[PDB]
C-alpha cells in the first residue's frame with residue numbers, strides 16, 4: 184500500500200518533531216470543519232484518526248492549542264500534528280493525528296432504537312460516567328466543549344471505553360468575556376443558548392450531557408424541535424414554565440416575553456416504568472433552568488446512579504473487566520477534592 | 534359517519550355565528566402547537582383543516598388576531614373559529630377552521646430529490662411568485678411570518694395554487710420593540726437570527742424565501758447545519774466572509790468575533806449548469822448579509838425570473854391556465870405602488 188511520511192510534532196511534551204509514517208488512509212468523516220481520515224501507523228500498526236482543517240496563518244488554531252494541553256483517558260489524545268497541502272495552492276492545512284475509536288454513542292443508540300430496544304443500563308452508566316470525567320477534566324482548565332452530542336462521543340465496543348472528540352467549538356470561558364450563543368447542536372442546547380445569552384458558563388456542557396442521558400434512557404431525544412420555540416415548548420412540557428428569576432439566571436433581557444403556562448410533568452412519568460429511580464434523579468439535577476443549580480461533572484460522577492460502577496464485582500456483559508474508572512488526578516479533582524472519598528472506592532488502585 | 538355540529542364565528546366580517554357541520558375528521562398534523570385535523574363540510578362536501586390549540590386563560594390568541602385580519606389568495610383563510618372542551622379535562626381549546634390544501638412544497642421537493650430529479654422551473658417560478666405575494670401582503674400590515682419553510686407552503690397539485698400556512702410564530706414587528714431571536718426553523722434562519730439579534734425586521738422572511746428558492750433549484754438545502762456555527766460556515770462558503778459593517782447591520786454586539794476568511798463562491802458555480810441565470814440573480818439579491826440590501830417581497834415579484842408568468846401564453850404543463858397572479862390590491866401594492874407597471878402585465882389590463 185501507499186506509505187505517507189511526514190515530519191510531525193508530538194502532541195504533548197517538548198516540540199521535537201519526528202518522522203511519522205502511516206498507511207491505509209480512508210475518509211471516515213466530512214463536515215463544515217474539513218475531513219477526518221483513518222490511517223495505520225507503519226511502525227506499531229496502531230490505528231489513528233487524522234483531522235485535516237484549512238489553517239490561516241493570521242491566527243493560531245484554537246483547537247490545536249486546547250488539544251496540546253489535554254491528557255485524559257476519556258478524551259481522544261493528540262498524538263502528533265503537522266502541516267501539509269490538500270486541495271488548493273497557497274492554502275496550508277493543519278493535520279491532527281488523534282486516537283482512533285471505532286464507534287459512536289449516536290450509532291450505538293440508533294441500533295437499539297431501530298431494534299425497538301433500549302441500551303442496557305450498565306452501558307448508560309459506563310458511557311455517562313466516562314463523559315462526566317472528560318467534562319470534569321476540561322472544565323478544571325476553564326475549557327467548555329460547547330458541542331456535546333452523541334456523535335462526539337466515541338466508543339470502543341470491546342472495552343466499553345468512551346472518548347470525547349471534536350474540539351472545534353471548544354473554548355476557554357473567562358468571566359466577563361462574552362461568548363457566541365450559536366454554538367451547540369440542536370436538541371442538546373441549554374435554554375440560555377436558546378435565549379441568546381453570551382454570559383453562559385461550562386454548565387452548558389452539563390445540560391447537553393443530561394440530554395444525552397435522557398435520550399439513552401428514552402430511546403429518542405428528550406427535547407426535539409426544528410426551531411428554538413419548539414425546543415423550549417418541549418423543555419417547558421417537562422420542566423414546567425420557568426419563573427422570572429429562572430429566566431433572569433438564563434438571559435436577563437428576555438423576562439418581558441411570555442411562554443404557555445404548563446405545570447411540571449413528574450420526571451418519573453417522563454421515562455418508561457422500569458427506569459432506575461437514580462437515573463431519573465440524575466436527569467432532574469442535570470436538566471435545571473438555573474445554570475448554577477445543575478450538578479458539576481465531578482458531582483455527577485459521585486451520584487448514586489454510578490454506584491454499580493464502584494462495585495468490586497462489576498464486569499462487562501462480554502465478561503471483561505470494566506475500563507479505567509478511578510485513576511483520578513489532582514487536576515481532575517480540583518473543583519471538589521473531598522469527592523475522592525466517594526470517587527475512588529476502597530478496592531481501587533492499590 | 535359521525536357528524537360534529539358547532540356554532541362558529543366567521544373568520545372575517547361581522548360576528549354573525551354560523552352553524553357548521555363537519556364529518557370524516559382525521560389527524561393530518563401533530564406538533565408542539567397542538568393538532569391539525571382534516572374534515573369534510575357536511576353540506577358542500579368541501580375539505581377544511583381544523584387547527585386545535587390550547588386557549589391561554591391570561592391573554593387573547595395572537596394567531597387568531599392575525600388570521601382575522603387576512604384575506605389573500607396565497608394564504609390559508611380563516612373560515613371560522615370556535616371554542617371546545619378538547620382532550621385534556623376542564624381546559625378550553627381554540628379551533629381554527631382553515632382552507633385545506635392537500636400537498637406541501639416539502640413533500641413535492643422530497644419526491645423529486647428521492648427520484649434524483651429537480652422540480653421543473655415553471656413550478657419553481659409559480660411557487661416562489663405566490664410565496665412573495667403572500668409575504669408582500671402580510672408585511673404590508675407590519676406582520677412577519679417568522680417560520681417560512683417548505684412544510685408551511687401548501688400546494689394544490691392540479692391548479693398550482695400555493696397557500697402560506699402556520700401563523701403560530703407570526704408577529705406584528707414594531708420598530709424599537711425587541712423580538713425573540715429563537716423563532717424560525719433550522720436551514721431557513723437569517724444570519725441576524727443566528728447572531729441573536731432582537732431588532733430584526735420582516736426581511737428575515739425574505740432570507741427564508743431565498744433559502745426555499747435555492748433548495749428547489751439545488752435539490753437539497755443550501756445552508757444545512759445542526760448548529761448555528763455550521764450554518765454560518767455554509768453561508769460564508771457561498772456569500773464570502775461578512776465585512777465589519779455587514780456584521781454591524783445584522784447584530785452590532787458580534788463585530789469583534791472572527792470567522793474563517795473565505796472568498797465569495799461565484800453563485801453560477803453553486804447551482805447545476807442548466808440553471809436559469811435569472812434564478813441565480815434572484816438568489817443573490819434575496820440572500821444578502823445586510824437585511825436592508827435584500828429585495829422586498831413586492832420587488833422579488835417584479836424580478837426578471839418571473840417574466841414567463843407575465844407571458845399571455847403561459848400554461849401549466851397539465852394544460853390548465855395558471856392560477857390568479859395579477860389580482861393585486863392597493864394594500865398589497867402599498868410598499869411601492871409604481872411596481873404595478875411591471876406586476877400587472879399589458880394583457881391583464883385589457
Ligand SMILES: CN(C)CCNS(=O)(=O)c1ccc(-c2cnc(N)c(C(=O)Nc3cccnc3)n2)cc1
Pocket residue numbers: 211212214216219232234259281282283284285286287290337348349350351
Ligand atoms: C461507517 N462509515 C460511514 C465510517 C465510520 N463512521 S462512524 O460514524 O462510525 C465514525 C466516525 C468517526 C470516528 C472517529 C474516530 N476517531 C476520531 N478521533 C474521530 C474524530 O476525531 N472525529 C471528529 C469528528 C468531527 C470533528 N472532529 C473530529 N472520529 C469513528 C467512527
Ligand SMILES: CN(C)CCNS(=O)(=O)c1ccc(-c2cnc(N)c(C(=O)Nc3cccnc3)n2)cc1
Pocket residue numbers: 560561562564566569582584609631632633634635636637640687698699700701
Ligand atoms: C403524514 N401525512 C401523510 C399526513 C399529512 N399530509 S401532508 O404532510 O402532506 C399535509 C399536512 C398538512 C396539510 C395542511 C392542509 N391545510 C392546512 N390549512 C394545513 C395547516 O394549516 N397546517 C398547519 C401546520 C402546522 C401549524 N399550523 C398549521 N395543513 C396538508 C398536507
